[PDB]
Amino acid sequence: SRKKIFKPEELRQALMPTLEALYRQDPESLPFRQPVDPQLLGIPDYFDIVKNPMDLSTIKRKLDTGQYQEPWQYVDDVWLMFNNAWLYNRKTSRVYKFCSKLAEVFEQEIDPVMQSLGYCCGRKYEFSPQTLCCYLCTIPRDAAYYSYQNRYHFCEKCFDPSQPQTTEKKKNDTLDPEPFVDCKECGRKMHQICVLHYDIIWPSGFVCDNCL
Ligand SMILES: CC(=O)N1CCc2c(c(-c3cccc4cc(-c5cnn(C)c5)ncc34)nn2C2CCOCC2)C1
Ligand SMILES: [Zn+2]
Ligand SMILES: [Zn+2]
Ligand SMILES: [Zn+2]
């Protein structure tokens, strides 16, 4: 019940250096300094594919007017901008490779900064894809396979006992967001894998090290 409230200036002063570190990159930040403009750039299908645009100058504006209540909302907007560019642009394009550079930079900046706002780290996604099971046989990362509605999986060399059975293609290269658990006292979202350990149990709810 002693919830942590971040004031705008606390967030701005801590996080703006991670944004400036992206803005610094030349030429890699140049497609990202201003909102995507589909008529000017002559890409009329952009908003058919990208439903929620995001860019460095919008993120800076939101930090400047205190529209972030807690720092993961900022991290989410950054990854939104990256994921928009990776989706819209082809793997071989300049814009895409620029995006992967900005991402590398951010992942190296964000952890100390999130730790100074009291968090475990600042990494949004899992390190590794989840080993999928082949319907004893399992599928490693990046391995190719066939799927149906996310449910049943088969390795390409193959392709509940009481449930009456009935009778596309992908690659296992996707990272899920790293799941969270809330501090019972301050309300901070921490990563389960960062703060929960095989030998500790939390009968009355997780409490982070700042609140202990
Ligand atoms: C971020 C995103 O998803 N966008 C969507 C696609 C896009 C963007 C930019 C773009 C916008 C503003 C500045 C840019 C600057 C450079 C640049 C500057 N120096 N260097 C070596 C490259 N490149 C692309 C830019 N173009 N396109 C393509 C337009 C069609 O034609 C091929 C490129 C934005
Ligand atoms: Zn963490
Ligand atoms: Zn198999
Ligand atoms: Zn706490």
Pocket test for ligand 1, best of 40, 95, 99 (most atoms within 8 A of CB): 95
Q: How far apart are CA 25 and CA 165, in angstroms?
A: 55
For the CA of 193, the nearest ligand: 2
Intervals of CATH 3.30.40.10 along the chain: 118-126+175-212
46, two tokens: 């952009």
Q: Which of 37, 41, 87 to mutate to test the pocket of ligand 1 (most atoms within 8 A of CB)?
A: 41
DSSP structure class, residue 183: -
Domain topology for 127-174: Cysteine Rich Protein (2.10.110)
Which CATH topology does 1-117 take? Histone Acetyltransferase; Chain A (1.20.920)
Backbone dihedral angles phi then psi of residue 177, each to the nearest 5 degrees: -65, 145
Report how far residue 183's alpha carbon sits from residue 210's, in angstroms, rounded to the nearest whole number. Answer: 10
Cβ pair 30, 128 in contact under 8 A? no
CA distance 34 to 55: 6
